[PDB]
Design a binder for this molecule. Structure first.
Ligand code: HEM
Ligand code: 174
Ligand code: CL
Ligand code: MG
Ligand code: MG
Length: 393
C-alpha cells in the first residue's frame, strides 16, 4: 500500500539537484518508505504540516535526526529544546522565546542594520566578491557572535561546529562520519563558551543564564540552551542570506522590484526561506501506531519530513518554482510549524531583512561572474562559493 523508493535524500547527487526527486517523492503518495534508510517519508505540504502539528504522536525526544535516542547514544547530550517534547520542552522554550523576543530585537536592530549597510558599501568598493565568504558568512559572523556575547578567541570553531551539528542529524553516511570524527576540539570550544563566566553581560548567552533565577530553567540547563543558539543561530542564517542573494542574482526582475520598494525586504527574505529552504529536513519518531496518508506506521518508526519539498508542493503553492517577493508566504514550513517552530525566527528575519534592505538601497545589479559551488550537508542546503559582481545603484 505504501510505495517503496530507493531515492537517497542524503546523497550528493540528490543535494546537487533535489527538485526532480522531491516531485517523485510527492507524487508517489502522501507517505513513502525510503528503503535506503528504513524510514517513512512525507514530502507534500499537507502531511508535513500535519506531522509537525501532531507532537504527541510524532515526537522529538527520540531525536530529530535519523538516529533514535531509544536505540543509540546521542553524539552529544540531547538539546533541551529541539530534542524534547512537552511538558519538558515548555519552560526551556519559554526562556529562549523571551531571550529572542520582540523586545530584544529593539536592542540589536540598529547595530545589525548598520553592520549590513556597512558590509554592502564595503563590497561595492571591491565590485567582485564571493557572496558566500564575503557576505553570507561575513555578515552573520560580524553581528551574531557579538550579540551572543562570545569572546573573540575560538570563534573559528563556530561554523565548523554548526556544520557538524547539521551533518549529525543525517544518516551515518560519509558526511556524518567525517563530521563526528575528531570533532572533540569543536565540541570543547562550544561547550566552554556556554559556561556563564565566558558570556558577556547583556548578550543572548548571559540573558539565558539570567533566567535561571526565575525557576524556568536550572543553572545546569542554561549551558545547553546557550548551546542551542550556537548550534542553530549562525549557519542557518548564513544559508538563508546566501539563498536570498542567490535568488536575487538569478531573478533580476525581483531584485528590481525590491529596489523599487525596499519595504519588501522582509518578505523577500521570507520568500527565499521558502524557495531554498535552508533547513531541508527533520525527522520525528512515532510514539504509537498511527495512520498517515492511508498508511499504517508502527510505533517507534522514524518519519522524515521534507520541508523544502512541502514549500514547493504545487498542491499548496502557485508557481512554487518561481521566486516572488510579494508572495503570501504565510504557512511555509521553512521555520517549522507548531510547538517547535523556530524560536530564533525573529533574529533570522532581522538579519535577512536588514541585509536585503541594504542591497535594495545600494545595489543596482547582482551578476554571477565565476564558478558557483554548492556546499553539501545532510540537513542544510546552500552554496560554498557564489562569485558575483555588484553594480552600485
Ligand atoms: C533562516 C534561518 C533559520 C532557519 C531556516 C531555521 C529553521 C528551523 C526549523 C525548521 C526549526 C524546527 C525544528 C523542528 O521542528 O524540529 C527550527 C527550530 C529552532 N531554531 Fe531555527 N532556523 C533559523 C534560524 C535560527 C536562529 C537565528 C536561531 C537562534 C538565534 C535558531 C534557533 C532555533 C532553535 C533553538 C530551535 C528549536 C526550537 C524548539 O525546538 O522549540 N534558528 N529552526
Ligand atoms: O541544538 C539545538 O537545539 C538546535 C539545533 C539546530 C536547530 Cl535547526 C535547532 C535547534
Ligand atoms: Cl557540543
Ligand atoms: Mg561526548
Ligand atoms: Mg576566563
Amino acid at each position: 500500500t505504501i510505495p517503496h523508493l530507493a531515492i537517497d535524500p542524503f546523497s550528493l547527487d540528490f543535494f546537487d539537484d533535489p527538485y526532480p526527486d522531491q516531485q517523485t517523492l510527492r507524487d508517489a503518495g502522501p507517505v513513502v518508505y525510503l528503503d535506503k534508510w528504513n524510514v517513512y517519508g512525507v514530502a507534500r505540504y499537507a502531511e508535513v504540516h500535519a506531522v509537525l502539528n501532531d507532537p504527541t504522536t510524532f515526537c522529538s525526544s527520540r531525536g530529530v535526526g535519523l538516529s533514535d535516542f531509544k536505540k543509540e547514544k546521542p553524539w552529544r547530550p540531547p538539546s533541551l529544546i529541539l530534542e524534547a517534547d512537552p511538558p519538558a520542552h515548555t519552560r526551556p522554550r519559554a526562556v529562549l522565546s523571551k531571550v529572542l523576543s520582540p523586545a530584544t530585537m529593539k536592542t540589536i536592530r540598529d547595530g545589525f542594520a548598520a553592520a549590513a549597510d556597512a558590509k554592502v558599501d564595503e563590497l561595492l568598493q571591491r565590485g567582485c566578491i564571493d557572496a558566500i565568504a564575503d557576505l553570507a558568512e561575513a555578515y552573520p559572523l560580524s553581528v551574531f557572535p557579538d550579540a551572543m556575547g562570545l569572546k573573540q578567541e575560538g570563534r573559528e570553531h563556530l561554523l565548523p561546529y554548526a556544520g557538524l551539528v547539521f551533518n549529525a542529524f543525517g544518516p551515518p553516511n560519509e558526511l556524518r562520519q567525517t563530521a563526528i570524527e575528531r570533532s572533540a576540539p569543536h565540541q570543547a570550544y562550544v561547550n566552554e563558551q556556554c559556561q556563564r563566566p565566558n558570556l558577556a553581560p547583556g548578550g543572548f548567552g548571559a540573558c539565558i543564564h539570567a533566567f535561571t533565577d526565575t525557576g524556568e530553567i536550572t543553572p545546569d540547563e542554561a549551558p545547553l540552551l546557550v548551546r542551542s543558539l550556537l548550534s542553530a543561530g549562525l549557519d542557518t542564517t548564513v544559508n538563508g542570506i546566501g539563498a536570498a542573494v542567490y535568488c536575487l542574482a538569478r531573478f533580476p526582475g525581483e531584485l528590481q522590484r525590491l529596489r523599487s520598494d525596499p519595504t519588501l525586504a522582509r518578505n523577500a527574505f521570507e520568500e527565499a526561506v521558502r524557495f531554498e529552504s535552508p533547513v531541508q529536513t527533520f525527522f520525528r519518531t512515532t510514539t504509537r501506531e498511527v495512520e498517515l496518508g492511508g498508511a499504517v506506521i508502527g510505533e517507534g518508526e522514524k518519519v522524515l519530513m521534507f520541508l523544502g519539498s512541502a514549500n514547493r508542493d504545487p498542491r499548496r503553492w502557485s508557481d512554487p518554482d518561481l521566486y516572488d517577493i510579494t508572495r503570501k508566504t504565510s504557512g511555509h514550513v521553512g521555520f517549522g510549524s507548531g510547538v517547535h517552530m523556530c524560536v530564533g525566527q525573529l533574529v533570522a528575519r532581522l538579519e535577512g531583512e536588514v541585509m536585503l534592505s541594504a542591497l535594495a538601497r545600494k545595489v543596482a545589479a547582482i551578476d554571477i561572474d565565476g564558478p558557483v559551488k554548492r556546499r553539501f550537508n545532510n540537513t542544510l542546503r546552500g552554496l560554498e562559493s557564489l562569485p558575483v559582481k555588484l553594480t552600485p545603484a
